[PDB]
Design a protein around this ligand. Structure first.
Ligand SMILES: NC1=NC(=O)NC(=O)C1
Ligand SMILES: [Cl-]
Length: 224
């Protein structure tokens, strides 16, 4: 199916340079199934981050690979379905920072869809994984797709704040360099850094200070 059927209109235009590579990745996933290997998230969720409007993205959160445990990955980085419990460790850590940074009560569930609906792009650099095999689809072709996405956001006239929660943070920074109104949060602790740099990093409040300083609306980070 063409991009226009898979992703939101603005994203379909932004991702046109990787249209053939996206189709190629569809073929890779089919071949995995044919080879007797599984992948996560579900096929219908692989491109889910790009189903919210490109034009309203104001914050980019970048992870590395999807959750490797069956029933966790849902196509938005770090998110889980609202009936998943206990939360994965990374997400529990994210929520302990959420409460500290913002002063909001602990969320009821792990669904980050409200962030996506408000202009937060919950991107992983690699969009699929073989279950129980962490980082197993590294180098299989997603990187050109997600790089295209990142560079497209940075080329927009609009403000953008980037939060780098993956191992490749240092490879990602240059992709964000050309954007005139792009601010990248540094340093780059990841959720599992926990009290050795992640807690107290204030990613949500800092994003909003930066957006407001650039004349953009803040993100409402509140979760139920
Ligand atoms: N634990 C996780 N690490 C990531 O980098 N991304 C995810 O979606 C989940
Ligand atoms: Cl985790």
């Amino acid at each position: 199916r063409p991009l226009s059927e898979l992703v939101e209109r603005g994203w379909a235009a932004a991702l046109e340079p990787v249209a053939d590579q996206v189709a190629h990745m569809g073929q890779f996933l089919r071949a995995e199934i044919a080879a007797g290997r599984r992948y996560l998230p579900a096929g219908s969720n692989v491109l889910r981050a790009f189903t919210f409007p490109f034009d309203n993205v104001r914050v980019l959160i970048v992870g590395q690979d999807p959750y490797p445990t069956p029933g966790h990955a849902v196509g938005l980085s770090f998110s889980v379905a609202p009936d998943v419990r206990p939360w994965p460790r990374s997400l529990a850590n994210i929520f302990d920072e959420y409460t500290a940074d913002l002063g909001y009560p602990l969320p009821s569930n792990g669904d980050l869809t409200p962030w996506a609906q408000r202009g937060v792009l919950l991107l992983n650099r690699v969009l699929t994984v073989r279950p129980s095999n962490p980082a197993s689809h590294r180098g299989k072709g997603w990187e050109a797709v997600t790089e295209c996405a990142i560079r497209a956001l940075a080329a927009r006239a609009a403000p953008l704040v980037a939060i780098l929660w993956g191992r490749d943070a240092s490879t990602l920074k240059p992709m964000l360099a050309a954007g005139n109104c792009v601010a990248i949060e540094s340093p780059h602790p990841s959720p599992l850094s926990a009290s050795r740099g992640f807690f107290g990093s204030r990613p949500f409040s800092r994003a909003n200070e930066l957006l407001v300083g650039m004349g953009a609306e803040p993100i409402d980070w509140r979760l139920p």
